[PDB]
């Protein structure tokens, strides 16, 4: 629902929330000098990173990868005929379950309405086959 | 405040921003780079002992 800043269909920027205090730092220094006076070449420096990869609200781009999609198609033996089930597992546990029908939708309600009704009694025969 | 201050407060302050500089780069979490140098610290045991002066020439080389 709606194109986000942080949420969109590409990717999320997902952020924890924050359980620890709102610790503030000020005057980074080494005991060469202030923080301002190196940052222009901290970009190499990892011991210099101020962002902690561990804190819930680090920025991270994850892309939206889709979970794993498996067509439980009409060709298996499983689906009672054409049935195009379509699964999204997480390994093998099911996540959501989207069956997709039609495969075997011939009009059978249009054409009956062309049908007298001795005609169209046949067809019922041919709906639930067992 | 001159050859006083090179040899001293305000020269070895420039040899220490230069140093420490080039030994923060090597501070990050790499296994390329530990092992590389883990490796090559082998290379003492099979020379023999009378190059480790040259060793030693060519790592402050490295520093510059
Ligand atoms: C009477 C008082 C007596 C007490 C004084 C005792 C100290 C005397 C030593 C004086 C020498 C240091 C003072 C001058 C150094 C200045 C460093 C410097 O300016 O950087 C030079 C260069 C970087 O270039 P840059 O500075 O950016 O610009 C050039 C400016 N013309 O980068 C360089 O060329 C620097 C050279 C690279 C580093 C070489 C490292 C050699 C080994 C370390 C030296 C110390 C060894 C200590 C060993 C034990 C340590 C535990
Ligand atoms: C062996 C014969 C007798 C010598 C006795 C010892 C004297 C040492 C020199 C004075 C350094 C000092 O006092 O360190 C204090 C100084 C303060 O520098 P600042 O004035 O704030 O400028 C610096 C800031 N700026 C330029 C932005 C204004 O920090 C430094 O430079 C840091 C480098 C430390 C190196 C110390 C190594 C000591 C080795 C001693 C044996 C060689």
Sequence with gaps: ?130 | RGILQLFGPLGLWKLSTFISSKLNKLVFLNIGFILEIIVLSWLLIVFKVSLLKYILLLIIFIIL
Aim: overall charge negative; aromatic content about 12%.
């Design chain 1, 1 to 130: 629902a709606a194109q986000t800043k942080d949420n969109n269909d590409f990717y999320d920027v997902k952020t924890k929330k924050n359980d620890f205090f709102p610790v503030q730092v000020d005057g980074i220094e080494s005991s060469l000098g202030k923080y301002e006076e190196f940052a222009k070449d901290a970009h190499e420096w990892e011991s210099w990173n101020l962002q902690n990869e561990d804190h819930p609200e680090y920025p991270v781009k994850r892309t939206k990868i889709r979970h794993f999609t498996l067509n439980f198609g009409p060709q298996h033996p499983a689906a009672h005929g054409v049935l195009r089930l379509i699964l999204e597992l997480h390994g093998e546990e099911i996540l959501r379950s989207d069956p997709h029908v039609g495969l075997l939708h011939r009009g059978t309600e249009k054409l009956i309405e062309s049908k007298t009704y001795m005609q169209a009694l046949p067809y019922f025969d041919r709906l639930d086959y067992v």
